[PDB]
Amino acid sequence: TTALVCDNGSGLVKAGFAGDDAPRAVFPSIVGRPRHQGVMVGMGQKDSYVGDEAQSKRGILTLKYPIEHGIITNWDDMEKIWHHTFYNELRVAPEEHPTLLTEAPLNPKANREKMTQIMFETFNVPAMYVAIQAVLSLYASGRTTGIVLDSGDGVTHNVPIYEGYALPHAIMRLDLAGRDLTDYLMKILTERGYSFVTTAEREIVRDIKEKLCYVALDFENEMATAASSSSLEKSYELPDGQVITIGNERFRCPETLFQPSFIGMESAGIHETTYNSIMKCDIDIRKDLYANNVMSGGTTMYPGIADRMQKEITALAPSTMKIKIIAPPERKYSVWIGGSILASLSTFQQMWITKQEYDEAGPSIVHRKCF
Amino acid sequence: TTALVCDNGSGLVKAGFAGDDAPRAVFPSIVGRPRHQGVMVGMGQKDSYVGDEAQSKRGILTLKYPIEHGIITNWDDMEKIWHHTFYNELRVAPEEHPTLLTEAPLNPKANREKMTQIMFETFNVPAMYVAIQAVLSLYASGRTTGIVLDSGDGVTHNVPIYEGYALPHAIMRLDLAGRDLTDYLMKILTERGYSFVTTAEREIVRDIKEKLCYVALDFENEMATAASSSSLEKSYELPDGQVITIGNERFRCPETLFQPSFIGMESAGIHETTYNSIMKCDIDIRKDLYANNVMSGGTTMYPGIADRMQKEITALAPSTMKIKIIAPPERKYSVWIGGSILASLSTFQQMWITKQEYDEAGPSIVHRKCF
Amino acid sequence: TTALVCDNGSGLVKAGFAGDDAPRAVFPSIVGRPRHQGVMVGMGQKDSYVGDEAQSKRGILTLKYPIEHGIITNWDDMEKIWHHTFYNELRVAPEEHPTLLTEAPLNPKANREKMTQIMFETFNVPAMYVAIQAVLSLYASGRTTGIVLDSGDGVTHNVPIYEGYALPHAIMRLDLAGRDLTDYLMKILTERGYSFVTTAEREIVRDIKEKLCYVALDFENEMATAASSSSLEKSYELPDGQVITIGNERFRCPETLFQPSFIGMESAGIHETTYNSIMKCDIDIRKDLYANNVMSGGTTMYPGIADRMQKEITALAPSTMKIKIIAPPERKYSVWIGGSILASLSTFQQMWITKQEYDEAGPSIVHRKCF
């Protein structure tokens, strides 16, 4: 009695069979529709494109994401994707295989409830389970207890976990991502003496961030040194036809995660927030949580972020603690992997949700059953 | 239920039966009337000559074209031609056979409407359809999707096409032809040191263009080399009784299509215009459109034009594209052939226009039904 | 110590003396060059015409605008214009009078820097200042705080302002203008049953928009009523020799500004964009900004646009706001007037930019000094 794992990401969709250790089918979750009327005339009496079919036609077409992190607002597009995943990608029948679905942290009551109903009434699967993306990531690292920061191509969250059990009532959402960082990056460049007011320049700033941004061991020490000298300056030539320069900007951009005050947020930096989440956690797992801090997703990929996290937590630490930061090599696909191992374990078998249980208790049962 | 195909060209008329792969009746569409009164006195109490009858009497008589590309202004002459085509040429009854008619791009509302009315009220055909000359050409090459440049003996147009569907709202008209090129050709010859001010000389320049003009791989490279040296010079003796010489002129004449700035036009060269038309096209057909560029008609016959087109498009191309230029051997009769294959296909059967549909919606229905 | 005000528009140039309340010298900024070679032969061994000299010769000559809104790409032509303005128009010496220059929103770093350098090194003026066209318009209405929509004969922008201070980092550019609207207008006419495929017809559509287009109190209500009935239909006879008709088209054309979705733009309507700009603004000026919304320029002239703006903003408003729309009678020349009043005020005297300040800080200093 194996199950299918469908991971709904913030930019990519991962599908596979239970007991498999690597995804064999990955594709973005996008809907292709014409940008404007001129595109529509040449469409050829057809509506839209779904899946890999629209992937190579992306520039011309408007791509809409069924998932906003976050929250699924377009149900009609989302349905097409699941169909495409099970049929065109997986090439298996949903009725003969159970389905494992992922959910965004703090998922709305209407949104979580509608999805489960579709799986049984529409697809008519024998049994399906819904799990948290952050929870899955911890399993992949092989750690049952820990805290995982999940940043994908949409949203970033801090979720504490014990022996596979999470605390949804204690999950905080971070709205700070690379795009926000880029606007800050432009602000710092302007102070330096480089003007990036035009739209073309802003795109260039984005490229600069992606390839020329890293984080230093001590921000206050490094920022002042970079601000008063040209020792850390770098220059990059883009294929478009012009040359731009970046200096203190390279480490200042990622800094805002640690110090939100630079962008203008009421909430305190990520390093303190991680601390608050662990403090609110179970008494015998805190020791494990500090030594099991794991970051997941493409956005948090920036090298040295783990080292930078280590620097602030140790300096700002109280007294009865030790700080170690973990950054697994497979962190990009950590979320999918945890579900796979979890589904292959005996302990998780009792935690599955069936059709009969669903009808009587509703999708709400997820808070009581799902950790 | 077969149909007759009547192709109304910018100099030749092609007629035949549906399912036939080659025209068996071709003749120019001309009206013969006396040039002056002296011709009129010897006429023999008669008005004018229509069809093949006036073809061998062309020098003496004024030939008027019912079609200006373009736009049909003389209805009375045009009617005679259709009659001649169906009766004297085809030798079939219009009432027993459906008729397929062609139309010029951006055909005026009054002109398109009057023609269809004549076909049903006058000829009383069971059903008739009107198609675009450019659209037909693409079918002949066996390509359902592509972009075709149509240059005949009257006008040149760029029309994008997908699965047989065209975009009339996005069609641009080119007024640059060989005759315009010839005037330019005279201008360049004058700079060189050859004087062609007299009328007889101008005719000679025309002959020179027709037999001694070709296009080089790189215009800027070649023009400077030709201008500063006699290495590319050629001389031709006309049967009339005099000898003339052409050099850099041979490749400069066709160049204006690529670079309209030489003649004095606001609009940019043809290579850029083709690009603009494809960009405005449907998202999944653009990849096909670049690899399916097809040129049709006698004017664009000049060898090396396809090679020259290839050179500029690749050099001026952005980044996410590949450039291939197609020049089919049967391009002279490509327009007629596409209609023939199209009429023999099941998919096109649903796209035919009938008498009842016509009366309620009018000739306008053509934009909604005809691609 | 008075100054000269040179307003560089998107079609007209306004010049005058500081302390004057009305422009006494206005002329389009155009360069006259031959359309083609035939014009060139009759030129008379001369290059081009600048200023009022080329104004009555406009049909024959190609007119090039030094300013693209927007962005100045042709420096050589632009220089001639300033010379003509100060000398032939103004009839004053640039060296004895300070010069006030205007700039397009989001002006490129190279373009803004080159202009200021020319004013001091070339003209050698005692002192010159550069101001934003949108910022100037607010002063003319007599309001120091507000938000101004600037649409001329080139580009449309939304710029928030407080006590004379603007926010260039928060300025969004609108590419929607009457010409774009006209293409839409043709699309709606086609649906109705009127065919405007030919080029001559398109010009007619333009005339129709200019004289027969207005905006109704409720678009959704009115569009459906107009679509299903002939009650709002109008007909116009052009002097050329033909008669055309317009109905629902009259209010649908201006609508696209409110609802960009009709043309095919990712961005949301202007009414929402104005809201976003104010929200991002200073805390004590928002109350003033909503009650001080001012529109400037010829394109936004269409009567009822202010009334239409009022309808959507009130309906889509959250809770803690009141909506009032202001449309000053002198809005056509509002941009020039604000500079005039601003130059005559004591508060602005400290905000002027001098030669010594310029050389050390560069043209960039404009973001720090100019609001």
PDB file of N, CA and C in Angstrom, chain A residues 38-39 41-46 49 57 59-61, chain B residues 162-163 165-167 169 280-286:
ATOM      1  N   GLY A  38      -3.353  40.894 -28.994  1.00  0.00           N
ATOM      2  CA  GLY A  38      -2.569  40.511 -30.166  1.00  0.00           C
ATOM      3  C   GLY A  38      -2.141  39.046 -30.105  1.00  0.00           C
ATOM      4  N   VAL A  39      -1.758  38.587 -28.920  1.00  0.00           N
ATOM      5  CA  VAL A  39      -1.403  37.179 -28.713  1.00  0.00           C
ATOM      6  C   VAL A  39      -2.639  36.274 -28.937  1.00  0.00           C
ATOM      7  N   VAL A  41      -5.345  36.681 -30.869  1.00  0.00           N
ATOM      8  CA  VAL A  41      -5.755  36.506 -32.268  1.00  0.00           C
ATOM      9  C   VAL A  41      -5.025  35.321 -32.926  1.00  0.00           C
ATOM     10  N   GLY A  42      -3.737  35.194 -32.620  1.00  0.00           N
ATOM     11  CA  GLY A  42      -2.925  34.115 -33.173  1.00  0.00           C
ATOM     12  C   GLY A  42      -3.001  32.798 -32.397  1.00  0.00           C
ATOM     13  N   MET A  43      -3.777  32.766 -31.311  1.00  0.00           N
ATOM     14  CA  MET A  43      -3.902  31.558 -30.470  1.00  0.00           C
ATOM     15  C   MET A  43      -4.450  30.339 -31.225  1.00  0.00           C
ATOM     16  N   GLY A  44      -5.433  30.543 -32.099  1.00  0.00           N
ATOM     17  CA  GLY A  44      -5.995  29.411 -32.832  1.00  0.00           C
ATOM     18  C   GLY A  44      -7.176  28.744 -32.131  1.00  0.00           C
ATOM     19  N   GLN A  45      -8.238  29.524 -31.900  1.00  0.00           N
ATOM     20  CA  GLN A  45      -9.468  29.058 -31.216  1.00  0.00           C
ATOM     21  C   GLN A  45      -9.212  28.126 -30.005  1.00  0.00           C
ATOM     22  N   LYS A  46      -8.323  28.563 -29.116  1.00  0.00           N
ATOM     23  CA  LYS A  46      -7.997  27.806 -27.900  1.00  0.00           C
ATOM     24  C   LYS A  46      -7.836  28.749 -26.698  1.00  0.00           C
ATOM     25  N   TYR A  49      -2.680  27.141 -21.834  1.00  0.00           N
ATOM     26  CA  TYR A  49      -1.772  25.984 -21.840  1.00  0.00           C
ATOM     27  C   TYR A  49      -1.370  25.623 -20.393  1.00  0.00           C
ATOM     28  N   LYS A  57       6.844  28.453 -23.812  1.00  0.00           N
ATOM     29  CA  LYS A  57       6.047  29.551 -24.382  1.00  0.00           C
ATOM     30  C   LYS A  57       5.829  30.671 -23.348  1.00  0.00           C
ATOM     31  N   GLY A  59       7.574  33.460 -22.227  1.00  0.00           N
ATOM     32  CA  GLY A  59       7.752  34.901 -22.456  1.00  0.00           C
ATOM     33  C   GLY A  59       6.519  35.613 -23.015  1.00  0.00           C
ATOM     34  N   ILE A  60       5.907  34.989 -24.007  1.00  0.00           N
ATOM     35  CA  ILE A  60       4.708  35.509 -24.672  1.00  0.00           C
ATOM     36  C   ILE A  60       3.442  35.477 -23.792  1.00  0.00           C
ATOM     37  N   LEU A  61       3.284  34.399 -23.033  1.00  0.00           N
ATOM     38  CA  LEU A  61       2.097  34.180 -22.182  1.00  0.00           C
ATOM     39  C   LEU A  61       2.228  34.671 -20.728  1.00  0.00           C
TER      40      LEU A  61
ATOM     41  N   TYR B 162      -0.903  30.979 -38.587  1.00  0.00           N
ATOM     42  CA  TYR B 162      -0.845  29.813 -37.685  1.00  0.00           C
ATOM     43  C   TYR B 162      -1.937  28.798 -38.028  1.00  0.00           C
ATOM     44  N   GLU B 163      -1.536  27.532 -38.198  1.00  0.00           N
ATOM     45  CA  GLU B 163      -2.450  26.420 -38.547  1.00  0.00           C
ATOM     46  C   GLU B 163      -3.510  26.846 -39.581  1.00  0.00           C
ATOM     47  N   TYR B 165      -4.540  29.911 -40.002  1.00  0.00           N
ATOM     48  CA  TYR B 165      -5.155  31.167 -39.543  1.00  0.00           C
ATOM     49  C   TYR B 165      -4.191  32.349 -39.615  1.00  0.00           C
ATOM     50  N   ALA B 166      -4.681  33.409 -40.223  1.00  0.00           N
ATOM     51  CA  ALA B 166      -3.940  34.646 -40.424  1.00  0.00           C
ATOM     52  C   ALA B 166      -4.386  35.746 -39.464  1.00  0.00           C
ATOM     53  N   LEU B 167      -3.651  36.844 -39.485  1.00  0.00           N
ATOM     54  CA  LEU B 167      -3.912  37.990 -38.613  1.00  0.00           C
ATOM     55  C   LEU B 167      -3.984  39.276 -39.450  1.00  0.00           C
ATOM     56  N   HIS B 169      -5.460  42.091 -39.012  1.00  0.00           N
ATOM     57  CA  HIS B 169      -5.304  43.323 -38.230  1.00  0.00           C
ATOM     58  C   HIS B 169      -3.817  43.694 -38.031  1.00  0.00           C
ATOM     59  N   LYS B 280       4.360  40.047 -32.492  1.00  0.00           N
ATOM     60  CA  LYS B 280       2.943  40.340 -32.236  1.00  0.00           C
ATOM     61  C   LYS B 280       2.057  39.059 -32.330  1.00  0.00           C
ATOM     62  N   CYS B 281       2.661  37.974 -32.814  1.00  0.00           N
ATOM     63  CA  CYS B 281       2.001  36.663 -33.032  1.00  0.00           C
ATOM     64  C   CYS B 281       1.839  35.796 -31.761  1.00  0.00           C
ATOM     65  N   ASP B 282       1.059  34.722 -31.939  1.00  0.00           N
ATOM     66  CA  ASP B 282       0.711  33.736 -30.893  1.00  0.00           C
ATOM     67  C   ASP B 282       1.986  33.081 -30.301  1.00  0.00           C
ATOM     68  N   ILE B 283       1.946  32.842 -28.991  1.00  0.00           N
ATOM     69  CA  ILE B 283       3.093  32.353 -28.200  1.00  0.00           C
ATOM     70  C   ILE B 283       3.688  30.985 -28.621  1.00  0.00           C
ATOM     71  N   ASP B 284       2.890  30.003 -28.997  1.00  0.00           N
ATOM     72  CA  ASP B 284       3.461  28.694 -29.363  1.00  0.00           C
ATOM     73  C   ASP B 284       3.807  28.572 -30.851  1.00  0.00           C
ATOM     74  N   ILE B 285       3.567  29.615 -31.634  1.00  0.00           N
ATOM     75  CA  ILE B 285       3.846  29.530 -33.071  1.00  0.00           C
ATOM     76  C   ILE B 285       5.080  30.323 -33.504  1.00  0.00           C
ATOM     77  N   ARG B 286       5.617  31.138 -32.603  1.00  0.00           N
ATOM     78  CA  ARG B 286       6.775  31.978 -32.931  1.00  0.00           C
ATOM     79  C   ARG B 286       8.002  31.146 -33.295  1.00  0.00           C
TER      80      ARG B 286
END
